[PDB]
Design a protein around this ligand. Structure first.
Ligand SMILES: Cc1cc2nc3c(=O)[nH]c(=O)nc-3n(C[C@H](O)[C@H](O)[C@H](O)COP(=O)(O)OP(=O)(O)OC[C@H]3O[C@@H](n4cnc5c(N)ncnc54)[C@H](O)[C@@H]3O)c2cc1C
Ligand SMILES: Cc1cc2nc3c(=O)[nH]c(=O)nc-3n(C[C@H](O)[C@H](O)[C@H](O)COP(=O)(O)OP(=O)(O)OC[C@H]3O[C@@H](n4cnc5c(N)ncnc54)[C@H](O)[C@@H]3O)c2cc1C
Lengths: 416, 416
């Protein structure tokens, strides 16, 4: 209560995306005055370039920070709970390596939630009867009742609608696209947009996703990566066969094979596979430098999707729906995330611009934190964030190679 | 045979677009069984490539067929009336010729509706106080109380939700994209989509908009043209000045200068300005031929707009909002329509494929018929269409150059 919550003005940059919309929600819920909160985005909530603006994402419990608190809110929170579909979850593994690591995951996971090691092919087929007996020859599996999918875009849109009703201020397009912090004497006092509009506030959050490293100098702590996915379509008859099926994970990769209303199944590549290095000058960089900078999806449908991606996606379809191996993969697209070297979030005060805060480093697995992540960003703004989360999320330039991250390989560049 | 309405199966191709959605609505309303109606579209209603799927279009009364009737339904109909905003309409002219033609229009229009010739700049500024006094030096105007804008996308979405509720069958993507009619002895019995799905019905309607001449052979009765538009963004205080503004016409072209919630004003180019001639083989063409083929907005919202368009748009911004002449024109896009030579619709049985019906020839001015046009398509199917309308809309290959149409120039090709 230096300025009270009630009188403190906050700009959330990227407020039409996952962490940003969460932040704004939690400001309002925390007792910030709605009209004192300004949401700026290049595109109206839900942002058409937001990684979160999807028909569905997969909600799987992990060890990761906040996984279980997020899960709870998806189940209990009155805004979020109509967007989570608890279907149960099945992690499948074939071979020495996968079954080995499935056994490691099981050990960790069974301490956190009920999970069920599935030894027989019969036990597997009872949890998901849409698999065939000889498809799953040699398979083990963890079944967990806890797990499902999230109507991701709908959830952000519901945040947007609540924030509008409460009187949050909004700026989109040229009035929303961040150009620079306003700095007076090492202190951030607001934000200028590309149209020259200047918004003054006590605190500024940059929750710009994969655009974060492109808007402000992040010293390569975050490296933006494109994650390709596509669609197959099933007839109503084929679709009906996948009624009541669970979410399925091949190691670290989740899928969901029950079609939407139009027969569509979204299948993702195994990882963010691709950078788009270009010479670029984020605010705070003395000179241009080679940074991975996203291509907007509200300005790049039908962009050259790497054939490698299409092949891993077809591999996964072959594994889990052999009868559908021949289905054409259409509406191929990329959404962008940004990796830290360690896979943890970057949620910290900027080390030079006081009252400018980073809330990014999503690392391609933060949609599920949408209910809760904004709470912790508010705690950060108020200087009450737990040291454990502060450390995990700290400013940490030169703490590792974000291009590789925790992933098996460095990402290949799209230019190639 | 001749089934009852209640047992007649109808496929509507382009059912996520303007005339197609209106058709499907009028079939349901007319007493056809909802599950007997199949809506097929490349994209879910409202189609992202539909010329109808827009933040707004302008609703003016004209002499043209059905104009008054559609206006009445926009005002009366429970479904549509929430998407019509009656703001009044001001048609402005400058110069002896623009004023000469404006006098022509007054005479034709005063017969149809109330209308008010405005001879002074003071009577004009009282109808639109946003205009400056020196700006409108020399100007004349017609004011009509009857006129406003349409939430076009929202109306089609409303039709789609109602159709869904009633039990209308839908197919989209590969299951919705027309490949060919199914014919048996010169009688059309259904449709095949590009995924190979075969749909069987008694009657088929092709309401595929600018794509109609690309899917079946139309002997150049319809030529598809791109119509460019863009956006300017006003600050909230620039926006509030245009509260309560009417729609404005310079001769043929309408404008609406009151910003939406995000300060955006859409400004259209003066006409469909561009063809995309390409060798293409519609069903029923023995060989490929040079036809104007739309470039989908779903796929390519990143499309090279012609500077000529950007110029004419600037010039109309300059005319009506001189103080906003320096605003950047952004989210430039193209919307596709299909012109007949005479500008009338093409709504007719195919001359060879019995029970296959054309419902196209929108000519860039048929969004306003959304409430009513499907009634006349249903009457066509039932062989009760008034001969007056049937003649106006008839199959008429070789009846005139649709490339030029009722416009001044032939359209320029986007290749150049
Ligand atoms: C294919 C794919 C699958 C995924 N699957 C899962 C999953 O199953 N489970 C899971 O938990 N997570 C998943 N993720 C991650 C998920 O998408 C999260 O949204 C992501 O982890 C982080 O969101 P964010 O807030 O950091 O960024 P975003 O949600 O992308 O938001 C960033 C915002 O910044 C805005 N912005 C950009 N530039 C500017 C500017 N100049 N000015 C202002 N605003 C700007 C954007 O318009 C956008 O609205 C997946 C991601 C992808 C790409
Ligand atoms: C810039 C611009 C401004 C305009 N302003 C106005 C205005 O102010 N007032 C007015 O009345 N009109 C206006 N119009 C015109 C209006 O948009 C059109 O006249 C009308 O929307 C066209 O309706 P349609 O059903 O013929 O085409 P659409 O509404 O485009 O419908 C065509 C449908 O066919 C589908 N389709 C395409 N290929 C296939 C396939 N293979 N299989 C199945 N489905 C397919 C498409 O996806 C789409 O849903 C404007 C047009 C433009 C371009």
């Amino acid at each position: 209560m230096a300025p009270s919550r009630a009188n403190t003005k906050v700009i959330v940059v990227g407020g039409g995306g996952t962490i940003g919309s969460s932040t704004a929600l939690h400001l309002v819920r925390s007792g910030y005055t709605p009209s004192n909160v300004t949401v700026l985005d290049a595109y109206p909530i839900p942002s058409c370039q937001s990684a979160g603006n999807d028909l569905n994402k997969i909600m799987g419990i992990s060890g990761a920070p906040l996984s279980l608190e997020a899960f709870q809110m998806w189940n209990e929170d009155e805004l979020f709970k109509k967007f989570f579909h608890n279907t149960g979850r099945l992690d499948c593994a074939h071979g020495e390596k996968d079954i080995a690591d499935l056994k490691k995951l099981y050990q960790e996971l069974v301490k956190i939630i009920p999970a069920e090691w599935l030894d027989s092919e019969d036990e597997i087929l009872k949890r998901m009867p849409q698999l065939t007996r000889d498809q799953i020859k040699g398979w083990k599996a963890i079944f967990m009742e806890d797990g499902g999918w999230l109507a991701a875009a709908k959830a952000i849109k519901a945040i947007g609608e609540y924030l509008r009703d409460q009187g949050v201020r909004f700026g989109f397009y040229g009035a929303g696209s961040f150009k620079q912090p306003l700095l007076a004497e090492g202190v951030c006092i607001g934000v200028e947009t590309v149209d020259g509009t200047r918004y003054y506030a006590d605190k500024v959050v940059l929750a710009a996703g994969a655009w974060s490293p492109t808007l402000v100098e992040l010293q390569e702590q975050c490296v933006s990566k494109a994650w390709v996915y596509g669609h197959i379509q099933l007839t109503p008859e084929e679709a009906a066969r996948y009624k009541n099926s669970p979410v399925v994970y091949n190691g670290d990769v989740g899928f969901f094979f029950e079609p939407n209303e139009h027969g569509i199944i979204k299948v993702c590549d195994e990882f963010p596979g691709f950078t788009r290095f270009k010479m670029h000058q984020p605010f705070g960089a003395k000179a241009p430098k080679r940074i991975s900078v996203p291509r907007s999806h509200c300005k790049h449908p039908t962009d050259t999707i790497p054939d490698a991606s299409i092949v891993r996606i077809r591999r996964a379809i072959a594994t889990f729906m052999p009868q559908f191996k021949n289905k054409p993969l259409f509406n191929q697209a990329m959404c962008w995330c940004t990796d830290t070297a360690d896979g943890h979030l970057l949620i910290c005060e900027h080390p030079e611009w006081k009252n400018f805060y980073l809330a990014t480093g999503d690392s391609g697995h933060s949609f599920k934190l949408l209910p809760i992540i904004g709470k912790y960003v508010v705690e950060l703004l108020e200087g009450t964030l737990a040291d454990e989360l502060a450390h995990k999320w700290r400013w940490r330039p030169g703490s590792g190679d974000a291009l590789k991250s925790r992933r098996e390989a460095p990402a290949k560049d799209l230019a190639d």
